[PDB]
Write an enzyme that holds these catalytic residues in place. Sequence first.
Site, PDB file in Angstrom:
ATOM      1  N   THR A   2       0.852  -1.211   0.000  1.00  0.00           N
ATOM      2  CA  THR A   2       0.000   0.000   0.000  1.00  0.00           C
ATOM      3  C   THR A   2       0.884   1.257   0.000  1.00  0.00           C
ATOM      4  O   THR A   2       0.589   2.182  -0.739  1.00  0.00           O
ATOM      5  CB  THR A   2      -0.953  -0.059   1.205  1.00  0.00           C
ATOM      6  OG1 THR A   2      -1.699  -1.284   1.157  1.00  0.00           O
ATOM      7  CG2 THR A   2      -1.916   1.096   1.213  1.00  0.00           C
ATOM      8  N   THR A   3       1.897   1.334   0.869  1.00  0.00           N
ATOM      9  CA  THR A   3       2.747   2.542   1.022  1.00  0.00           C
ATOM     10  C   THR A   3       3.559   2.716  -0.257  1.00  0.00           C
ATOM     11  O   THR A   3       3.961   3.845  -0.527  1.00  0.00           O
ATOM     12  CB  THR A   3       3.683   2.447   2.229  1.00  0.00           C
ATOM     13  OG1 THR A   3       2.879   2.241   3.378  1.00  0.00           O
ATOM     14  CG2 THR A   3       4.536   3.687   2.443  1.00  0.00           C
ATOM     15  N   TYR A  45     -12.904  -4.482  -2.508  1.00  0.00           N
ATOM     16  CA  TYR A  45     -14.026  -3.981  -3.330  1.00  0.00           C
ATOM     17  C   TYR A  45     -15.116  -5.052  -3.501  1.00  0.00           C
ATOM     18  O   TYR A  45     -16.284  -4.681  -3.307  1.00  0.00           O
ATOM     19  CB  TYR A  45     -13.513  -3.443  -4.666  1.00  0.00           C
ATOM     20  CG  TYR A  45     -14.574  -2.750  -5.474  1.00  0.00           C
ATOM     21  CD1 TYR A  45     -15.102  -1.553  -5.054  1.00  0.00           C
ATOM     22  CD2 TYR A  45     -15.105  -3.326  -6.612  1.00  0.00           C
ATOM     23  CE1 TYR A  45     -16.112  -0.918  -5.759  1.00  0.00           C
ATOM     24  CE2 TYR A  45     -16.097  -2.690  -7.350  1.00  0.00           C
ATOM     25  CZ  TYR A  45     -16.582  -1.461  -6.939  1.00  0.00           C
ATOM     26  OH  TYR A  45     -17.545  -0.791  -7.643  1.00  0.00           O
ATOM     27  N   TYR A  49      -2.697 -10.575   4.572  1.00  0.00           N
ATOM     28  CA  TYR A  49      -2.760  -9.138   4.935  1.00  0.00           C
ATOM     29  C   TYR A  49      -4.229  -8.771   5.086  1.00  0.00           C
ATOM     30  O   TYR A  49      -4.985  -8.831   4.098  1.00  0.00           O
ATOM     31  CB  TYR A  49      -1.954  -8.349   3.907  1.00  0.00           C
ATOM     32  CG  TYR A  49      -1.906  -6.839   3.989  1.00  0.00           C
ATOM     33  CD1 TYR A  49      -2.273  -6.128   5.109  1.00  0.00           C
ATOM     34  CD2 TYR A  49      -1.426  -6.120   2.899  1.00  0.00           C
ATOM     35  CE1 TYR A  49      -2.194  -4.744   5.130  1.00  0.00           C
ATOM     36  CE2 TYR A  49      -1.387  -4.734   2.887  1.00  0.00           C
ATOM     37  CZ  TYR A  49      -1.764  -4.043   4.017  1.00  0.00           C
ATOM     38  OH  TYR A  49      -1.653  -2.687   4.041  1.00  0.00           O
ATOM     39  N   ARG A  73      -9.480  -0.498   4.318  1.00  0.00           N
ATOM     40  CA  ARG A  73      -9.125  -0.271   2.901  1.00  0.00           C
ATOM     41  C   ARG A  73      -9.911  -1.233   2.009  1.00  0.00           C
ATOM     42  O   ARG A  73     -10.166  -0.846   0.854  1.00  0.00           O
ATOM     43  CB  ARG A  73      -7.620  -0.440   2.624  1.00  0.00           C
ATOM     44  CG  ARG A  73      -6.704   0.547   3.334  1.00  0.00           C
ATOM     45  CD  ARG A  73      -5.290   0.321   2.862  1.00  0.00           C
ATOM     46  NE  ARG A  73      -4.354   1.313   3.375  1.00  0.00           N
ATOM     47  CZ  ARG A  73      -4.209   2.530   2.899  1.00  0.00           C
ATOM     48  NH1 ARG A  73      -4.945   2.943   1.879  1.00  0.00           N
ATOM     49  NH2 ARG A  73      -3.310   3.330   3.436  1.00  0.00           N
ATOM     50  N   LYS A 109      -0.130 -10.075   8.369  1.00  0.00           N
ATOM     51  CA  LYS A 109      -0.013  -8.653   8.606  1.00  0.00           C
ATOM     52  C   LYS A 109      -1.380  -8.107   8.845  1.00  0.00           C
ATOM     53  O   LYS A 109      -2.375  -8.354   8.150  1.00  0.00           O
ATOM     54  CB  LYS A 109       0.575  -8.001   7.423  1.00  0.00           C
ATOM     55  CG  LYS A 109       0.557  -6.506   7.593  1.00  0.00           C
ATOM     56  CD  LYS A 109       0.986  -5.897   6.272  1.00  0.00           C
ATOM     57  CE  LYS A 109       0.921  -4.401   6.381  1.00  0.00           C
ATOM     58  NZ  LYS A 109       1.256  -3.936   5.052  1.00  0.00           N
ATOM     59  N   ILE A 158       5.019  -4.488   9.924  1.00  0.00           N
ATOM     60  CA  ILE A 158       5.282  -3.941   8.576  1.00  0.00           C
ATOM     61  C   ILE A 158       4.804  -2.483   8.651  1.00  0.00           C
ATOM     62  O   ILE A 158       3.614  -2.267   8.810  1.00  0.00           O
ATOM     63  CB  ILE A 158       4.644  -4.835   7.496  1.00  0.00           C
ATOM     64  CG1 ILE A 158       5.336  -6.211   7.431  1.00  0.00           C
ATOM     65  CG2 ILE A 158       4.637  -4.141   6.134  1.00  0.00           C
ATOM     66  CD1 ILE A 158       4.495  -7.306   6.748  1.00  0.00           C
TER      67      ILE A 158
HETATM   68 NA    NA Z   1       4.998   5.029  -2.721  1.00  0.00          NA
END
Ligand code: NA
EC number: 4.3.3.7
Lengths: 294, 294, 293, 293
Positions: B46-47, B109, B135, B140, B163, B205
Amino acid sequence: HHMFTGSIVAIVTPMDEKGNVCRASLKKLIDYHVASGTSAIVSVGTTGESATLNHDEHADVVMMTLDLADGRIPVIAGTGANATAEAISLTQRFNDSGIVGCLTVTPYYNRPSQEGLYQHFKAIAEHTDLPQILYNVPSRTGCDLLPETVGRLAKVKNIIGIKEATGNLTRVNQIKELVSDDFVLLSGDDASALDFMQLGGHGVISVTANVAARDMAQMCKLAAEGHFAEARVINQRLMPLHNKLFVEPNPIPVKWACKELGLVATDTLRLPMTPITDSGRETVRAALKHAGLL
Amino acid sequence: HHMFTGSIVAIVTPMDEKGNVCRASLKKLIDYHVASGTSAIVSVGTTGESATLNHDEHADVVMMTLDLADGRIPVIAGTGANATAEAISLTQRFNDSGIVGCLTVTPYYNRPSQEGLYQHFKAIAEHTDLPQILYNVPSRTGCDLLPETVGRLAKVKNIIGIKEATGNLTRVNQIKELVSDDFVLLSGDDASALDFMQLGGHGVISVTANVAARDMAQMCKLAAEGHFAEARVINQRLMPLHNKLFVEPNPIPVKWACKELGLVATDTLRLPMTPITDSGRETVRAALKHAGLL
Amino acid sequence: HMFTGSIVAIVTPMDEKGNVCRASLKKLIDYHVASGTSAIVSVGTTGESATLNHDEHADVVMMTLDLADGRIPVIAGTGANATAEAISLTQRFNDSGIVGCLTVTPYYNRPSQEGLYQHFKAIAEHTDLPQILYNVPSRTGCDLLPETVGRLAKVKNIIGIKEATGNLTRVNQIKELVSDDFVLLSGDDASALDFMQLGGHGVISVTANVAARDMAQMCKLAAEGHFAEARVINQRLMPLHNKLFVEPNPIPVKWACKELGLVATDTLRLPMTPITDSGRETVRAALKHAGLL
Amino acid sequence: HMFTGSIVAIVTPMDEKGNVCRASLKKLIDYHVASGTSAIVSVGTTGESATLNHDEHADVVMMTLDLADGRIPVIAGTGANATAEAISLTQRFNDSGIVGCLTVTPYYNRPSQEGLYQHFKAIAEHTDLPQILYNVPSRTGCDLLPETVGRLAKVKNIIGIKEATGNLTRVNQIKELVSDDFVLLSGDDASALDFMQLGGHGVISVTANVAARDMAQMCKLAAEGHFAEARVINQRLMPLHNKLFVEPNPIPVKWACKELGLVATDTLRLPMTPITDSGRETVRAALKHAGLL
Ligand code: NA
Ligand code: NA
Ligand code: NA
Ligand code: NA
Ligand code: NA
Ligand code: NA
Ligand code: NA
Ligand code: NA
Ligand code: NA
Ligand code: NA
Ligand code: NA
Ligand code: NA
Ligand code: NA
Ligand code: NA
């Protein structure tokens, strides 16, 4: 306006046993919606398994839906993506396809800001002449397009409406009062859609319309004529379907119901959708029977 | 076990002003993590803006990260997708790449059932020899992988950990008691990660580790040694960052912080991420200063 | 020390008319003395504080004190959503022999953080008795935040909090704002062991009404850092921790008390109603899981 | 007819000692008579029911009845979380002259749907007065569901509900389970017009304390199906609808009453505390938006 009002079906993508689009089944569905008085078809929304088609199969289903429609019923293409560049790319594939409009969901998973949503939908709108219907569904996306941001986007020439799927009926007049009279307000929540129309909504993009098209068309036309007691009679008949079509993840129940009514050959889905449970089968059958469809 | 414990950075994908991966900036980040004692790098989580890279750029960033790592620090590839066939395809691209494992998010989704999640992760696990870290991040994704389903999946040979990013610390011992002793429990929520380790978690994480790598490595090693008062001293220093790195959508704040510390050339992101606001800049600067980094 | 370990939120046993049953309360208090319960909370939530008037409330506390007979400390429920009523109820127990007061955030009227501060500060200033703040937003509509707990901890006889959110992030958020001898107690059985492992000192327990020996053992093992052993006990109690809320508390725990022979009658006051057939079967399976039946 | 339109959840105006101020209450009741308010709810939530004892509660209701002097119907707040106390409070108003009772779901003790049924059924059986059920889960910890409202609607003197969830799906869920003369009232100012447009008959209003003329006009226009005109009024009231909750109710509306000259003092009882500077500025901007200042 008028084309984007009334009962709009969020159509299943019927599949064979291998998970590939079944044209003969889709043809049956589209002839059904033409006969039933459905206003329009949303092609490859959530109920159409947008999540599990790659952009090529996605495009194929939309063009197939247009081809089978053969001008008899308007087609709106699902064009949502959580990357702005991908939303623009998907939108450009349908420019000059014959679709009348696009249904474009707020980015999912990456949780953009209200400014991110503004810049996302504005950039999409600038890359097409096609009408754009914003789609708010926080339960699926992790983000909430608020009325203030809807008002901002409504000023962009080809942003013409929203498919409000929160089930939060306070959104109807919060949006209406920030937008022009011809900005289209559509429910994305079957169980609250008649309430949504009674507050000023113009129609619904409906999973229930997949199996009760003629009832859903009649209910939306009665709501538009202001005959809410007559509309509620249909809604009470349909309410167990409105709820039980989500007893397991959409579109698992509605594909099973379509198969049971003989509208499609196969209730096959793609992972991570899995076959309906025994308990879900008996729940959806009781709901179809309550609507007088079985 | 051991490789998948301690401070694991959810590394930014540093970009030039056009939004393309900046190799020189990524090299600086990776030399930083090697020097700081970070246990491993999660590449394109994600990051890392997984949402706005296509699968080709995704693969490029992972292979670039592996190449720059040059065996000095383990690399875990983000391999999540909301279609099972796509998760398998993305996983197969990295088989025999040199990554040590995969981080695979619950479908977003499409809101699969607990049985859908089981069949999804089992199918992925059967298409690789690589270790798989589940995860869970419902804020999200719109779905919640429950401890019962984690226990089910933990029996699959190469499903080795989770995670857990709910911030719901009751999950630690609910999962631990359904799984073997070498099943890895990692926080995905910086603000609650030390609490998570104090309850039995093996590491985190971390977005915060992007800009406070040496502090986050030290805090996780102290937690593992059972020195929680010494770990809390670091956590109190870092807590404004743990929170304010989400003051605007991740990774907008952490990319700005990386640029401000001279760790990357540019804080550029891809739509629908937008530049940090004036107010967010002053909030993240106060947080960096509180951690003694500025 | 007296405000740590397993503290029972004790039921107010009733006869069939809904009046306190002294003989059943005597047996519960003997049971808690023999089982190693650290203290009794008298007329908290589990004690049907909602359905006793202030006179019946005071009588139950004085009866509990009398029966305890110095063998086990008694903490009085003293909560009210009006500050003048909280002071008045508190003033009834001054010099009673109770060692302290458990005082819930005002319910229904939803005060601000500033109102909670002024409420608890006013109460504290009208007593010499130690005060344990009680946060339970699910029942009250009101959430006492760590920052406000820090403010209140500075008032001399505000000595601790029963944290009943089940949000385990509150343990270290509060602990870092308060002195080392501010007591942190779980108000949530299902997450209590976790709460103690993060640095909590004990629990105010529904489960301890029927598993007092296991609950005392789990809190003592946790305090000594024997977590592996404490988790084995938590696993055999977890069905009670959850299913004692399968219907509104204290409907299940009163049925469990009667079924174990600890009280004569499972009678409650409206609007609590008798346990359902389905409830009885759920609670019996949980008692059996705990090795109690 | 008497249980429809704009019903004010009237403040209990106080002097600086926190005692009811008759002269201020007289002016509020004259104001409601002149403005077309349909009825007064006496000692509901906005009337600080939480901080008046039952004697002060009864005195405020009897004072409100006396001042109304037959010019405007009075509905008494009669809620309690103990069924015996709800009956007892109800029995005080039998033959008082009030036209009905507003009875909130028990707060704090979180009864089942079956407990709510037995609670309201017992109350109804101890009075001839019409009963309006009151659902406000944000304050109570308890949610009276449409199915249970349907069950209760069959009891002869259970005549309606104040639905304060702000969940507008409850209007037609309840309406389809009950007779055509079961009254549906909003308890949520910000969503009240929406509630009436879905088929609600009126609102029990905080906003009506300071915008009584606009609130009466909006409910009457909605009842006659003049929604365009009713929306224009709702838009000028929406800042009050929201900002009268910017701090705990009734802190803002009491400050607004004082600022408009409707009451002598904005005094409340703990744990309500005086409006903040920021609150005053927010509420003044909302009064100005409504054309009241
Ligand atoms: Na990034
Ligand atoms: Na489909
Ligand atoms: Na479905
Ligand atoms: Na960030
Ligand atoms: Na009790
Ligand atoms: Na005990
Ligand atoms: Na409260
Ligand atoms: Na706890
Ligand atoms: Na219980
Ligand atoms: Na008042
Ligand atoms: Na009025
Ligand atoms: Na309650
Ligand atoms: Na309402
Ligand atoms: Na107010």
